[PDB]
Amino acid sequence: KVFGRCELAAAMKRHGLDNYRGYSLGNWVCAAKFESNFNTQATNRNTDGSTDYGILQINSRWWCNDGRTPGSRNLCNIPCSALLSSDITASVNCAKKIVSDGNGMNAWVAWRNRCKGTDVQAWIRGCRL
Numbered sequence: 001k002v003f004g005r006c007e008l009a010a011a012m013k014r015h016g017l018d019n020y021r022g023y024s025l026g027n028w029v030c031a032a033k034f035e036s037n038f039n040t041q042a043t044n045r046n047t048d049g050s051t052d053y054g055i056l057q058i059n060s061r062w063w064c065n066d067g068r069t070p071g072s073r074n075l076c077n078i079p080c081s082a083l084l085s086s087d088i089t090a091s092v093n094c095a096k097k098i099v100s101d102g103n104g105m106n107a108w109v110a111w112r113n114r115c116k117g118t119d120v121q122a123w124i125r126g127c128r129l
């Protein structure tokens with residue numbers, strides 16, 4: 001599913017991501033924009049052989065099981081395929097664990113490089129929330 005900007009903001013809020021660990025909704029929408037362009041089915045293969053999955057490009061080295069990432073963990077206790085669903089529940093719940101892991105949203109290098117320090121509220125501007 002490719003979400004609309006406000007549609008995704010609303011779904012993220014519904015699932016308790018708004019201001020989670022102090023990160024406003026615009027941060028999460030911005031991260032999703034640059035990680036996946038709002039496409040739940042986004043996948044990308046990393047140089048280390050791990051893969052990133054879903055709207056927030058969650059990585060199989062630590063967070064989910066895909067059966068093809070040697071020496072990896074599955075800390076969210078989910079198949080990576082669950083992160084591709086039109087229903088963002090699994091992605092949101094896993095993101096909550098990731099952002100609580102110590103480095104906040106810096107876990108998403110694209111958030112650090114493209115969202116951090118910017119006017120992230122622009123991502124939810126105009127949205128009925």
Ligand SMILES: [Cl-]
Nearest residue numbers: 024025026121
């Ligand atoms: Cl915001």
Ligand SMILES: [Cl-]
Nearest residue numbers: 067068069070
């Ligand atoms: Cl594996």
Ligand SMILES: [Cl-]
Nearest residue numbers: 109110113114
């Ligand atoms: Cl980047």
